Amino acid sequence: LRRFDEVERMVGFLNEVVEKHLSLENVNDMVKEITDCESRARQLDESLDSLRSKLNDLLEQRQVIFECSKFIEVYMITGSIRRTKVDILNRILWRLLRGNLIFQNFPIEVEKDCFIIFTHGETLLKKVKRVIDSLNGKIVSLNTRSSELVDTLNRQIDDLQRILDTTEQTLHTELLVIHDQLPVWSAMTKREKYVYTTLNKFQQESQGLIAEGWVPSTELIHLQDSLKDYIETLGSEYSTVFNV
Amino acid sequence: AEKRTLIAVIADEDTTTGLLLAGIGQITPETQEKNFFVYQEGKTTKEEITDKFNHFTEERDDIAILLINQHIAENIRARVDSFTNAFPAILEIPSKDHPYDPEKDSVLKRVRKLF
Amino acid sequence: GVYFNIDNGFIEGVVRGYRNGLLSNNQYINLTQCDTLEDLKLQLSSTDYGNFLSSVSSESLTTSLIQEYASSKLYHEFNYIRDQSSGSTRKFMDYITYGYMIDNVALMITGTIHDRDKGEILQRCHPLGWFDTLPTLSVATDLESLYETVLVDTPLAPYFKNCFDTAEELDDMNIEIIRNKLYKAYLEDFYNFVTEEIPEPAKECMQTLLGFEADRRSINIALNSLQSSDIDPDLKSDLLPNIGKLYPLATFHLAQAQDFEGVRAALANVYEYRGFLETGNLEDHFYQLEMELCRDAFTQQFAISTVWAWMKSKEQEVRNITWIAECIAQNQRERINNYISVY
Amino acid sequence: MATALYTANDFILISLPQNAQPVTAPGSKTDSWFNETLIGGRAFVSDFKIPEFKIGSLDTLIVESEELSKVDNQIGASIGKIIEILQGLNETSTNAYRTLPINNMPVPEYLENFQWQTRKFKLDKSIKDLITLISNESSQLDADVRATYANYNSAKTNLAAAERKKTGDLSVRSLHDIVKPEDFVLNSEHLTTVLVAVPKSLKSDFEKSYETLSKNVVPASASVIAEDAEYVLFNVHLFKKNVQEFTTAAREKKFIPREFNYSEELIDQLKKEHDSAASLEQSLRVQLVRLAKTAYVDVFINWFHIKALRVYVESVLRYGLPPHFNIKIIAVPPKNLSKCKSELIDAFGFLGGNAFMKDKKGKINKQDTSLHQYASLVDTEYEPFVMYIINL
Amino acid sequence: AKQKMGRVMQTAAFSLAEVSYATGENIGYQVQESVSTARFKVRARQENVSGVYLSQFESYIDPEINDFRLTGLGRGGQQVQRAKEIYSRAVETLVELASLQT
């Protein structure tokens, strides 16, 4: 029963991935293709969201160059930050450097934001970075050009977007054989766990289960005619005992 | 040298409780076996202390210093005396409401002869 | 005082008789002159404790066995007074034991997180705070399966009104929160019971004795939250009771009290608690003010607050005897006169 | 506004560039404006011109401000405790030591004649050593004043225990100043004396019982040698073996024996304890009152040394050049601080920010928030020009 | 050092005991769940005392380790709070003296 709890969790994961975009051997070989497909779907989804994050880490780095070459065309620190922490970073840097700064922000278009500091001086430059890196700000130091890193970064944006277009095509190829098959894999487990939950309710006394429970009196002869015909038609000469 | 940084305790309940609060011992998160042993005076058999003795000295190896009450150490006198190693250290201190005695102190006996 | 002695005539005069067994200052000085726990037993045998340690006989006599038996006879005297109570008096006696039931709940569900045995975490429980499903708190870990299985049929069930179970089962950090919040709701309910149904001479001197419990618990929560807690004030204000002398202006400043000075400047504006946080042992200040509030609750005659004022004074008597017997057994006598005696 | 106000004047310490001009009175002089215009002319201006110091580099400069803030607050706190140790001792009651001399010169008069003190603090020395020297002096001095006030409190406790032993309440008390050779006999060993602490009701009960408590009890010994409110203290002489029977018999009657014999060494040592305890508290109290007063002045000179330093370095950080500043200490009359602070902000605020400026007043101290604490180590609310508020 | 440790251990033990009894619940059970780290640990060094290497220990107190939550019990919580403070001081004694024993 813990097995078909785990497989129920795996069928639930397959139901979440699609929304996000029987004999004992016949169950034992289909739980194998549940597990063997859950493994590849989980690793391909975890190699896709962690790659989308790496894509956004470059699309946020292109924008803080586009919005800070423009500020110069109209001892400085340039980087990315979440938008809900811009005011608290402004206040912490204003309380650290008493004045002594020219702080801007330009919204990158989770939502994020850029910032320029102009730390006028020294001896706090490694201490501003302990404010920025504490609340998860990613500084983008360039030191060469605002037109040479953009080429080497657009040579990675498209090169990684093509890996997105490969792995997501493989994902939508894999989901075609699963979306038309989940009502079988789910409905197997929903009744198999229901079988074993009921088999936990039996006695297991002397290498044989004792099932005590209620049945209406109209359906007594139906049990005594359906249980008697079924144990004899399959062979296996060890008859059941039906007492009242 | 360093491969041990717990101090284990064989002591009366109050003394042990206190010591733990102060932070010396622990209940481990992957063995789920205490690295201290509480004792109800006179209510706990001498055989249970001995199992626990073996446990800190030998069956565990993360024990640096083994603290042990003089009242308790005396009951299981045989096992303590036979332990002569430095890994873990055996340091007998007076029990609660019991005074010093040189003869409830395993190491002091050892040192005195063959000086 | 014209309708008091109908159901409470015999109850008061025995409790007033129990008051006369409170040890005076000379009966404490005669205990501080003892040399042995046996001499302290024989000195207590001339008081109204007489022959309560008779089944001990000088060998197994420790300073914790005195605290066990001296409090056990307090509990049996409380049960005798409670068995003769009826009506609003019996309900008032039950509402006293609810605050010990809360402490036994919070002591029983910490003995299961640490996986200590159930037979030894119950001998440390309080005998007056006994309900029939108290050992069965060792069945679950989370708060919801301990409420909905055990604590619904208990009289502590209306007190689980703000305990938000976020499906985190239990550490030691939130059991204290549940304890403080149950005691908060209990202080609210028992103040409303005293204001509602208890008669007028036993109302004004019981609202002060209960608002003092609320103020002491507010100061202890707002001062123990410095060291072993990092909580928000909006979640801290659900732990402070709102019945006391200290609530509407000072528990707000105790809620946003991030430092020791945030507590001290908050308690400097209240008039009878200023100077507690300056010098001396703070717990001794609260116990001294508790006894000075229980002393002038015996001076009003036809009042059921004499039961509260008796049992808290008798608990302080057991604490003073325990402190003296701890001093004369460990041979430390530098602070043997640190007892509290207003009687 | 205030923080330990007696009747002491409150001070605002300001520094400005030498190009600064007020905008509240255009074309006017700064020095003239402070005396004349400023809060209805009830402003008393005193000099407070701080010399040049060795200023670090840019990286070192950030770190110099961070430390000035911390050290300033320590010294300020520590002085607050010293004042308190005096207040409690009753050496500061109406007013004392906030207006009292500081090396034979009152506190307000001392600030006006304060320009830097070349007592051991030199301008041929580095900034760093100036912060380390002054702060060490301030900590060390506070620690000695604290150690004596702790010891004095202990000493009072011993004396109090002793007086009660020498007479007061019986429960631990044995007498030693009311000895006599016949009301207290022990010269061989046959006779001894047991003292019995008897409640007043029980006084008649003892006079009747004394003989019956044991056999061989000396006749007519029962007399009250000493008497207090709760208890009457008796002497009875009897044989030594019989002392055990006597004591047990005494406790049934519901008396409390107090055991004291007339051994010579006993009498002498208890008497000694009273005396030795009075002499310890006495000597200590005289050195301790003296030590705090002497500590008080030193930590005062040291508190202002940091502020002067603090203000100077800060001025350099915020305005830049010139390194030559126009610096004053303005004595504000009590409760005009808020009005004074605002006027200064309007005039001079434009210099340090034309947008980094808002109106503000007074000084509020908190641990609710860190805002409004005017400091360069924690985040505060940025002042539009360098102004520090001193509350005495 | 044996005599000195014994006095310190008995005094800290009695203050802890008094508190356990007054609150009306056994603190030690509460304490056993919460203990899952140790503040006072030792770091080992080999020291040449003559030609032979002996074991020496130098003790560290983890400042990255918070207070356990066994406080806030009401009036009973004040009692535990004072109790841990005497005991951390006391326990330090036992370990520093113990380094010579090994």
PDB file of N, CA and C in Angstrom, chain D residues 9-14 34-35 38 43-48 111 327-333 340 388 390:
ATOM      1  N   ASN D   9      21.604  73.287  30.775  1.00  0.00           N
ATOM      2  CA  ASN D   9      21.512  73.711  29.405  1.00  0.00           C
ATOM      3  C   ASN D   9      21.694  72.726  28.403  1.00  0.00           C
ATOM      4  N   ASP D  10      21.093  72.847  27.192  1.00  0.00           N
ATOM      5  CA  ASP D  10      21.123  71.766  26.169  1.00  0.00           C
ATOM      6  C   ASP D  10      21.939  72.468  25.103  1.00  0.00           C
ATOM      7  N   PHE D  11      22.616  71.630  24.315  1.00  0.00           N
ATOM      8  CA  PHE D  11      23.596  72.178  23.419  1.00  0.00           C
ATOM      9  C   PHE D  11      23.328  71.528  22.052  1.00  0.00           C
ATOM     10  N   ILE D  12      23.590  72.345  20.993  1.00  0.00           N
ATOM     11  CA  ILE D  12      23.615  71.848  19.627  1.00  0.00           C
ATOM     12  C   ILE D  12      24.944  72.247  19.095  1.00  0.00           C
ATOM     13  N   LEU D  13      25.677  71.260  18.515  1.00  0.00           N
ATOM     14  CA  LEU D  13      26.995  71.427  17.987  1.00  0.00           C
ATOM     15  C   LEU D  13      26.796  71.405  16.498  1.00  0.00           C
ATOM     16  N   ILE D  14      27.281  72.527  15.793  1.00  0.00           N
ATOM     17  CA  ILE D  14      27.120  72.592  14.364  1.00  0.00           C
ATOM     18  C   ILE D  14      28.419  72.879  13.748  1.00  0.00           C
ATOM     19  N   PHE D  34      23.477  83.440  14.405  1.00  0.00           N
ATOM     20  CA  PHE D  34      23.368  82.587  15.513  1.00  0.00           C
ATOM     21  C   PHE D  34      23.025  83.268  16.772  1.00  0.00           C
ATOM     22  N   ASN D  35      23.686  84.436  17.131  1.00  0.00           N
ATOM     23  CA  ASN D  35      23.427  85.183  18.345  1.00  0.00           C
ATOM     24  C   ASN D  35      22.108  85.994  18.276  1.00  0.00           C
ATOM     25  N   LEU D  38      18.493  83.915  15.692  1.00  0.00           N
ATOM     26  CA  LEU D  38      18.245  82.566  16.124  1.00  0.00           C
ATOM     27  C   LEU D  38      17.521  82.526  17.462  1.00  0.00           C
ATOM     28  N   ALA D  43      19.403  82.855  22.133  1.00  0.00           N
ATOM     29  CA  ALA D  43      20.467  81.967  21.760  1.00  0.00           C
ATOM     30  C   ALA D  43      21.850  82.504  22.279  1.00  0.00           C
ATOM     31  N   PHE D  44      22.566  81.703  23.135  1.00  0.00           N
ATOM     32  CA  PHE D  44      23.869  82.120  23.668  1.00  0.00           C
ATOM     33  C   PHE D  44      24.853  81.275  22.911  1.00  0.00           C
ATOM     34  N   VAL D  45      25.806  81.923  22.200  1.00  0.00           N
ATOM     35  CA  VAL D  45      26.749  81.263  21.325  1.00  0.00           C
ATOM     36  C   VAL D  45      28.027  81.349  22.058  1.00  0.00           C
ATOM     37  N   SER D  46      28.758  80.223  21.917  1.00  0.00           N
ATOM     38  CA  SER D  46      30.026  80.043  22.510  1.00  0.00           C
ATOM     39  C   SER D  46      30.861  79.481  21.362  1.00  0.00           C
ATOM     40  N   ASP D  47      32.174  79.787  21.415  1.00  0.00           N
ATOM     41  CA  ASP D  47      33.153  79.195  20.495  1.00  0.00           C
ATOM     42  C   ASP D  47      33.247  77.721  20.786  1.00  0.00           C
ATOM     43  N   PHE D  48      33.586  77.015  19.641  1.00  0.00           N
ATOM     44  CA  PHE D  48      33.937  75.650  19.681  1.00  0.00           C
ATOM     45  C   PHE D  48      34.496  75.222  18.303  1.00  0.00           C
ATOM     46  N   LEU D 111      32.643  74.075  28.081  1.00  0.00           N
ATOM     47  CA  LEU D 111      32.399  73.873  26.706  1.00  0.00           C
ATOM     48  C   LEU D 111      32.849  75.069  25.900  1.00  0.00           C
ATOM     49  N   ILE D 327      33.048  76.428  12.987  1.00  0.00           N
ATOM     50  CA  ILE D 327      32.446  75.535  13.963  1.00  0.00           C
ATOM     51  C   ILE D 327      32.141  76.235  15.339  1.00  0.00           C
ATOM     52  N   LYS D 328      30.888  76.022  15.868  1.00  0.00           N
ATOM     53  CA  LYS D 328      30.341  76.635  16.977  1.00  0.00           C
ATOM     54  C   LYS D 328      29.647  75.664  17.847  1.00  0.00           C
ATOM     55  N   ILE D 329      29.536  76.010  19.171  1.00  0.00           N
ATOM     56  CA  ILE D 329      28.675  75.294  20.144  1.00  0.00           C
ATOM     57  C   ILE D 329      27.734  76.353  20.566  1.00  0.00           C
ATOM     58  N   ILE D 330      26.398  76.073  20.484  1.00  0.00           N
ATOM     59  CA  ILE D 330      25.336  77.054  20.657  1.00  0.00           C
ATOM     60  C   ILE D 330      24.693  76.445  21.870  1.00  0.00           C
ATOM     61  N   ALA D 331      24.530  77.249  22.866  1.00  0.00           N
ATOM     62  CA  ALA D 331      23.803  76.916  24.094  1.00  0.00           C
ATOM     63  C   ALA D 331      22.343  77.344  23.844  1.00  0.00           C
ATOM     64  N   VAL D 332      21.434  76.312  23.946  1.00  0.00           N
ATOM     65  CA  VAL D 332      20.007  76.499  23.750  1.00  0.00           C
ATOM     66  C   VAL D 332      19.421  76.542  25.099  1.00  0.00           C
ATOM     67  N   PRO D 333      18.556  77.409  25.414  1.00  0.00           N
ATOM     68  CA  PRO D 333      17.862  77.347  26.691  1.00  0.00           C
ATOM     69  C   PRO D 333      16.824  76.167  26.716  1.00  0.00           C
ATOM     70  N   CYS D 340      14.991  75.750  17.520  1.00  0.00           N
ATOM     71  CA  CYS D 340      16.310  76.008  17.088  1.00  0.00           C
ATOM     72  C   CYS D 340      16.810  75.140  15.920  1.00  0.00           C
ATOM     73  N   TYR D 388      24.534  67.871  15.444  1.00  0.00           N
ATOM     74  CA  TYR D 388      24.477  66.835  16.469  1.00  0.00           C
ATOM     75  C   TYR D 388      23.910  67.483  17.613  1.00  0.00           C
ATOM     76  N   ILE D 390      23.046  67.439  21.802  1.00  0.00           N
ATOM     77  CA  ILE D 390      23.698  67.050  23.056  1.00  0.00           C
ATOM     78  C   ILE D 390      22.695  67.398  24.097  1.00  0.00           C
TER      79      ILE D 390
END
